[PDB]
Amino acid sequence: XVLXEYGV
Amino acid sequence: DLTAFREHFAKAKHIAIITGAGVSAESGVPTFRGPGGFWRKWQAQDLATPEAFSRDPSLVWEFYHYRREVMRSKMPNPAHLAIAECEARLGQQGRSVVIITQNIDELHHRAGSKHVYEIHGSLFKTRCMSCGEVKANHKSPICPALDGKGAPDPNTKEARIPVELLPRCERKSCNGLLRPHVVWFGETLDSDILTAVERELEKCDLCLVVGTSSIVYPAAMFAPQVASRGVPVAEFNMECTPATQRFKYHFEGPCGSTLPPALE
Amino acid sequence: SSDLTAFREHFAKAKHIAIITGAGVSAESGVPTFRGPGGFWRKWQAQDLATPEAFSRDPSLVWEFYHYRREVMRSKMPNPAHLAIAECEARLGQQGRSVVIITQNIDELHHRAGSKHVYEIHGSLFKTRCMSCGEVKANHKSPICPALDGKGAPDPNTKEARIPVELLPRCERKSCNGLLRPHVVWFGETLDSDILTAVERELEKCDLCLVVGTSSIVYPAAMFAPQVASRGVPVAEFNMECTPATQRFKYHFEGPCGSTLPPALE
Ligand SMILES: [Zn+2]
Ligand SMILES: [Zn+2]
Numbered sequence A: 001x002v003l004x005e006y007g008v
Numbered sequence B: 001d002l003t004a005f006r007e008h009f010a011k012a013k014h015i016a017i018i019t020g021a022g023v024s025a026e027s028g029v030p031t032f033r034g035p036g037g038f039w040r041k042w043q044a045q046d047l048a049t050p051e052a053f054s055r056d057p058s059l060v061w062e063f064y065h066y067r068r069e070v071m072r073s074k075m076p077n078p079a080h081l082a083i084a085e086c087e088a089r090l091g092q093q094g095r096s097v098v099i100i101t102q103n104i105d106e107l108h109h110r111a112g113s114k115h116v117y118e119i120h121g122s123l124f125k126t127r128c129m130s131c132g133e134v135k136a137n138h139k140s141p142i143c144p145a146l147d148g149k150g151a152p153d154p155n156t157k158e159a160r161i162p163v164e165l166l167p168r169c170e171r172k173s174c175n176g177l178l179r180p181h182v183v184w185f186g187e188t189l190d191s192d193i194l195t196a197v198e199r200e201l202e203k204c205d206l207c208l209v210v211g212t213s214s215i216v217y218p219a220a221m222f223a224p225q226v227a228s229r230g231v232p233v234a235e236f237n238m239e240c241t242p243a244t245q246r247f248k249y250h251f252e253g254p255c256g257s258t259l260p261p262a263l264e
Numbered sequence C: 001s002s003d004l005t006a007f008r009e010h011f012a013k014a015k016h017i018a019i020i021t022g023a024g025v026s027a028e029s030g031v032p033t034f035r036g037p038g039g040f041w042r043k044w045q046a047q048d049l050a051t052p053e054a055f056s057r058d059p060s061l062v063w064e065f066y067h068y069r070r071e072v073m074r075s076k077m078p079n080p081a082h083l084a085i086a087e088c089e090a091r092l093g094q095q096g097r098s099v100v101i102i103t104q105n106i107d108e109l110h111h112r113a114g115s116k117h118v119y120e121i122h123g124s125l126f127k128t129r130c131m132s133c134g135e136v137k138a139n140h141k142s143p144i145c146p147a148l149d150g151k152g153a154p155d156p157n158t159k160e161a162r163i164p165v166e167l168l169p170r171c172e173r174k175s176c177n178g179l180l181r182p183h184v185v186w187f188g189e190t191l192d193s194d195i196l197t198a199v200e201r202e203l204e205k206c207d208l209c210l211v212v213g214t215s216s217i218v219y220p221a222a223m224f225a226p227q228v229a230s231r232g233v234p235v236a237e238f239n240m241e242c243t244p245a246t247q248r249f250k251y252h253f254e255g256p257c258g259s260t261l262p263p264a265l266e
Helices: B002-011 B021-025 B050-055 B057-073 B078-092 B107-111 B191-203 B223-227 B255-263 C004-013 C023-027 C052-057 C059-075 C080-094 C109-113 C193-205 C225-229 C257-265
Strands: B014-019 B096-101 B116-118 B121-128 B134-136 B178-182 B206-210 B233-237 B250-252 C016-021 C098-103 C118-120 C123-130 C136-138 C180-184 C208-212 C235-239 C251-254
Touching: B002 B255, B014 B078, B014 B191, B050 B057, B057 B121, B057 B178, B057 C257, B078 B096, B078 B107, B078 B255, B096 B191, B116 B191, B191 B223, B206 B223, B223 B233, B233 B255, B250 B255, C004 C251, C004 C257, C016 C080, C016 C193, C052 C059, C059 C123, C080 C098, C080 C109, C080 C257, C098 C193, C118 C193, C193 C225, C208 C225, C225 C235, C235 C257, C251 C257
Parallel strands: B014 B096, B014 B206, B096 B116, B206 B233, B233 B250, C016 C098, C016 C208, C098 C118, C208 C235, C235 C251
Antiparallel strands: B121 B134, B121 B178, C123 C136, C123 C180
């Protein structure tokens, strides 16, 4: 799954 | 160039509008990013996380209670509406218009946009931590214990509510703890939603990025897909647009001003 | 009364609210109204064109003027007041609480914010009246008719469309085929007795009245707010007219409606 803000 | 944009808009038949928090900001909604964006002693980054919730729901719920209450005085700006109206106006003629939004304040819903994708979920939706149910909730206060808590001042004492008295699952066969049905830092987006969006974008023949830019999350997950098919993309935001290297359709300045002319 | 939270406790208690809107609210949405000092249309102000004679004597021209006004709404959105109202009306109704708008405006902006129990007392731009048989239907067609298509340009210089009357909008119930006019009140035209009776009823029922983007002391707000205030029902003004210290009613709330009102009604 896609993190919010790509992890940041 | 404006009238260039207008002739795609004329021709175009499946439009997909991505909204950032620029539009929310234009309605007076706070958004807790950088320059002066704190709540009491913390920025969003501290509170909008699963651990913060595990570790202090009283506090997290205060934060979120406050955000729910502020919407009571905060109305949809002219963009929110031009969209809603354009969606409706176009649909009449069998023309498709969908909103894809990083915002969670239901302001599109209130302007009356219908085919909408809330990709961060919503403030006015609740998820039971026990059974997992997702129901809408616009109660003010969401529960007695929070009644007029969540005040935004650095100094404010913490409501310090016992967890049993935070909002709970009304299906009392469970009575689990509810959380805001919102995507937090370090949580994945709903694959179901992205598939639907991915479909929707692939169908689109004109894309609008509004109150944000193509180059940053979340727009940047999508704009490529559509741009890569040669579909024109148009930004409407406050980001400045350097000399010499102006994009094919940047529309600098507040959405509320820029957009309704564009969409009429 | 400057004081906010005082007002809020009537609002809490109150069960039939009646909100009167002036053109202040329309102005706050960018809507032009052609009286104000610099606001002409080609060679004339509203006063010249918004009359029965002007219509009898040059419908081509009047219809141009009105065609243009209809089209400008296409870019002009409801401001936060228009909505707070609509939302408050809806939110209150849920709890069996009554909310009605009484409005001097003719731009359907309340309708578009989604207010329902509304009284357009000057009629509306987007309603048509047959001169022959008298029929009243809504009309949002753009253009209202082919002959006016992209006419009505506002520049002093602009040539007149000069349309022959048979090609101006007509009664499509061809049992008649009369000429249509805008279903609006013009200068020197009295208000619909039907509507006033309904309003008179509505006001008599109300236990809180709001005057918005106008003031109690001037026509036509002054036909209403006094009647109800005089029975001790509280009246609250929300406007940008200074209306000097003595002319403010119970609660004044000076400054733009869009700012002032949503806090008040939430
Ligand atoms: Zn549950
Ligand atoms: Zn007729």
